């Protein structure tokens, strides 16, 4: 009764972290088999089309991060963004919760950020039909704004959270963000137990810095370039701590909340594994393996309470392997 899920090593610290996931999995006796599929940095699409076929087959994937090159031709669209649109993974969920072990400027933070993941900035169309003038054309729809709002409230209700906050720029973009805001309202009616509020993205960034404890669940269209996601990651400790997940009606792809490949620290045994590990935990919850996920997650959080196991990114002096060693140590205890 073992599951088969696609693994994408990706670039940078990706592959090395994937190996640690495997070893942790073997030691926790989790019933999962990893079917590896690689995605390099050539133009040729078939590198990315093969992964599509693999994920369609297995319906669940865990991945590292693909290196991005903003010096390549506009015909070369982002691999990760093709992956999300092609598989219709419309719900991007990121849990930015404070870790007791990690010292920051803000404490008691617990935010669930839900973001549209198929339109908006992914729909972007640029053309230079007149020399020296670049025009862009984005799309936002009623159908996709409803599903992302429908997902947030359902996730809000089932997680036992009280409030969903819509973040928008409807003061500037009357028609677009106004439609999104109205689509959130339509859903808000069918969830009377959930408090529904909305906030301008400008104000939302300022509040995040000053009083981020006010936010519960946040739902937003795919604009503003992941400002909210990253501000919140920075808030709780950084890109080494936060996990991300991409849900569709059928498919699901799990990863870190950041797109950073960590090129500069790759193969030095110093990368923070907790982001990827918590992501693997989210993946296990999706596969209905709730016992195995709680075991690993608890082991990660516990080893994080110890500052000696901390990696250089959060100020500690431990190595990746040493961190994994303590993670595995906590799993063997509860078994």
């Amino acid at each position: 009764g073992r599951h088969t899920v696609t693994m994408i090593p990706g670039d940078g610290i990706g592959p090395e972290l994937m190996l640690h996931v495997k070893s942790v999995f073997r030691h926790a006796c989790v019933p999962v088999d990893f079917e590896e599929v690689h995605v390099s940095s050539n133009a040729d699409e078939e590198d990315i089309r093969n992964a599509i076929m693999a994920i369609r087959r297995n319906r669940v994937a865990l991945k590292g991060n693909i290196e991005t090159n903003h010096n390549l031709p506009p015909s070369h669209k982002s691999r990760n963004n093709i992956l999300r649109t092609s598989l219709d993974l419309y719900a991007n969920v990121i849990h930015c919760k404070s870790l007791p072990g990690v010292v920051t400027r803000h404490k008691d933070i617990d935010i669930l950020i839900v973001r549209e993941n198929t339109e908006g900035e992914y729909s972007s169309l640029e053309h230079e039909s007149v020399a020296g003038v670049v025009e862009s054309l984005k799309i936002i729809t009623k159908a996709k704004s409803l599903r992302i709002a429908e997902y947030a409230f359902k996730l809000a209700q089932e997680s036992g959270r009280k409030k969903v906050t819509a973040v928008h720029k409807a003061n500037i973009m009357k028609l677009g963000d106004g439609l999104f805001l109205q689509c959130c309202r339509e859903v808000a009616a069918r969830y009377p137990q959930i408090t529904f509020e909305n906030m301008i993205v400008d104000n939302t960034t300022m509040q995040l810095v000053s009083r981020p404890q006010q936010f519960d669940v946040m739902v937003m269209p795919n604009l503003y370039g992941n400002i909210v996601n990253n501000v919140c990651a920075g808030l709780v400790g950084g890109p080494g701590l936060v996990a991300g997940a991409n849900y569709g009606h059928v498919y699901a792809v799990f990863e870190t909340a950041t797109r950073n490949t960590g090129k500069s620290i790759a193969n030095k045994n110093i990368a923070n594994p907790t982001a990827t590990l918590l992501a693997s935990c989210m993946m296990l919850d999706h596969l209905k393996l709730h016992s195995y996920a709680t075991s690993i997650r608890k082991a990660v959080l516990a080893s994080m309470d110890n500052e000696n196991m901390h990696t250089p990114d959060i100020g500690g002096q431990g190595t990746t392997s040493e961190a994994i060693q303590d993670v595995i140590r906590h799993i063997r205890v509860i078994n």
Binding site: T68, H70, L72, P74, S78, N81, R105, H106, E121, Y122, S124, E126, H127, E128, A131, G132, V133, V134, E135, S136, L137, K138, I139, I140, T141, K142, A143, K169, I172, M173, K174, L175, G176, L179, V201, D202, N203, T205, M206, Q207, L208, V209, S210, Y224, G225, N226, I227, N229, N230, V231, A233, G234, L235, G238, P239, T258, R259, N260
Partner: protein, 327 residues
């Protein structure tokens, strides 16, 4: 000699706080005389009255309070009519006023013509809305040239271009392209490029690394407001808009706050600090330095306005600064 500056007191707290700056400029005995114009919209064919335009066109320096937003925004009309294309927001931590961030000292320079501003939005078919923005080769170059010009003059040492060229490949690519051109001709200033999200990620963590940031207006003032959040908010943040023809209008980003409008509770700090910016743009540095020091000293002491958690009043707070300046 005395130079003359067009004053546009705003709405709500606008006249109140304008009043306070003048009072302090007077206590500071600074060579400034205020030519007040109260500009409201007239004609569509919307425009600001000629008498206001000529006033600004002559004096070159404007100071303005918050404007109520009603057809086309007045702010919009100002931007277009004087071609204000560079928005400057210097965000520096306040010693009297404690936030989780203390080491903050940044200048955010943003393009002020295109992007959101040039946007057209429309319904394509029911339930489908499309947004149209643009960036030009000319406008990116202009803002970059300004960015390095500002860095050199204001004794700043690093300029960082903030982009999202992974997604806005063509638009942000063209922006970087021009920032690089200008960096080549201005090697005194250390230049790098960062993605918007990484900048936000790092800003939250340690804003001490950043110096001067330049960006296009595809995203609006979100990042500058992020920085304002770091130093205590919109109550204390100066803003300046620099345009064509040597015109420069300095303003406050905080709103009108009408519910508080009477009773002089309002905090005139932001508008004052904007005037300090204005003084320096003019080159009245000593005066800028004194008025600023008095304002910082007055806060560090605590006589604070309610929003800063003082029980003190606008008049007192202004009065206290006035008194300090004189020595």
């Amino acid at each position: 000699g005395v130079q003359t500056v067009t004053l546009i007191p705003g709405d709500g707290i606008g006249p109140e706080i304008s009043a306070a700056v003048m009072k302090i400029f007077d206590a500071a005995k600074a060579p400034i005389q205020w030519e007040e114009r109260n500009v409201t919209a007239i004609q569509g064919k919307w425009m600001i009255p000629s008498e206001a335009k000529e006033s600004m066109d002559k004096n070159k320096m404007g100071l303005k309070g918050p404007l109520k937003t009603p057809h086309p925004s007045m702010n919009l009309l100002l931007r277009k009519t004087f071609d204000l294309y560079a928005n400057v927001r210097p965000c520096v931590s306040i010693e009297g006023y404690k936030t989780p961030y203390t080491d903050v000292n940044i200048v955010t320079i943003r393009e002020n013509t295109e992007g959101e501003y040039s946007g057209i939005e429309h319904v394509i078919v029911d339930g489908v809305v499309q947004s149209i923005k643009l960036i030009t080769e000319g406008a990116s170059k202009r803002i970059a040239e300004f960015a390095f010009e500002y860095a050199r003059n204001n004794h700043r040492s690093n300029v960082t271009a903030v982009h999202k060229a992974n997604i806005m490949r063509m638009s942000d690519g063209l922006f970087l392209q021009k920032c690089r051109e200008v960096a080549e001709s201005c090697k005194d200033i250390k230049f790098n490029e960062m993605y918007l999200d990484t900048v936000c990620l790092n800003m939250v963590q340690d804003p001490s690394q950043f110096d001067v940031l330049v960006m296009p207006n595809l995203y609006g003032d979100i990042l500058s407001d992020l920085c304002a959040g770091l130093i205590g908010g919109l109550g204390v943040t100066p803003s300046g808009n620099i345009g064509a023809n040597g015109v420069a209008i300095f303003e406050s980003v905080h709103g009108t706050a009408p519910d508080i409008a009477g009773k002089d509770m309002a905090n005139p700090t932001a508008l004052l600090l904007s005037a300090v910016m204005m003084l320096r743009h003019m080159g009245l540095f000593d005066h800028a330095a004194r008025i600023e020091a008095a304002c910082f000293a007055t806060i560090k002491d605590g006589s604070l306005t309610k929003d800063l958690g003082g029980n003190a009043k606008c008049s007192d707070f202004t009065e206290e600064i006035c008194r300090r300046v004189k020595d």
